[PDB]
């Protein structure tokens, strides 16, 4: 581990600086180093880990989609053969993306999830596990595609089960989990009805719990509720 010689607190501090500088690859490397110290993460540190890798893999996904579109257009009838290069470069980006997903899943398995006992930590990490298997599923085509999809589903389902027992319906982690599992249903599992039902029920149950919240909690929860509504509008 190239961060092995850096203090945990210094890694966290530099992750925050890297975020301010929009240096998300550095931020992810610092947070990987922090996780590898072996101590549990705080709520804020979980956010730093998630933001870093979400931005890294999000950029990879966007690039993969551009390249995969070009590759598709080059395979249609009437397109001029341009050689192996588009496929090769799409594969290069894909392999890098898969490497990042493997890294995140590795941190979750060794050993974040097994030490996470509170709902706010355990649901967060299980949601992340679902997310990174979902990103692997977006690019998968081989013998293990169904197993990858099922690994995402299983992680999301365990997170959902805990969140419904242990968190109020407005908790932002519970809401974000439902948002993302709904997207999984729609985009990965070919289950648009489940996606829509989950988004609607999540939204409605959150609405009915807003009255219990402070102004600041209300702002946090309604922000994610609007994302649920946005997706419902896209899908209906």
């Amino acid at each position: 581990g190239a961060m092995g010689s850096m203090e945990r607190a210094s890694l966290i501090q530099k992750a925050k600086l890297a975020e301010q500088a929009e240096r998300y690859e550095d931020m992810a490397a610092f947070m990987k180093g922090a996780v590898e110290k072996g101590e549990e993460l705080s709520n804020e540190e979980r956010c730093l880990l998630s933001v870093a890798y979400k931005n890294v893999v999000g950029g990879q996904r966007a690039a993969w989609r551009v390249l995969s579109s070009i590759e598709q257009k080059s395979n249609e009838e009437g397109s001029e053969e341009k050689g192996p290069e588009v496929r090769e470069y799409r594969e290069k980006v894909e392999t890098e993306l898969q490497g990042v997903c493997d890294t995140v899943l590795g941190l979750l398995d060794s050993h974040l999830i097994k030490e996470a006992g509170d709902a706010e930590s355990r649901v967060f990490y299980l949601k992340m596990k679902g997310d990174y298997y979902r990103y692997l599923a977006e690019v998968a085509t081989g013998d293990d595609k169904k197993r990858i999809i099922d690994s995402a589903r299983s992680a999301y389902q365990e997170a959902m089960d805990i969140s419904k027992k242990e968190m109020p319906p407005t908790n932002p982690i519970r809401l974000g989990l439902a948002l993302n599992f709904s997207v999984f249903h729609y985009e990965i599992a070919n289950s648009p009805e489940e996606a829509i039902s989950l988004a609607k029920t999540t939204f409605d149950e959150a609405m009915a719990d807003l009255h219990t919240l402070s102004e600041d909690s209300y702002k946090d929860s309604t922000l994610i509720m609007q994302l649920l509504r946005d997706n419902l509008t896209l899908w209906t």
Binding site: D131, G176, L179, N180, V183, Y186, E187, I224, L227, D230, N231, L234, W235
Partner: peptide, 5 residues
Amino acid sequence: FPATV
């Protein structure tokens, strides 16, 4: 693409 967090 749909929203995720």
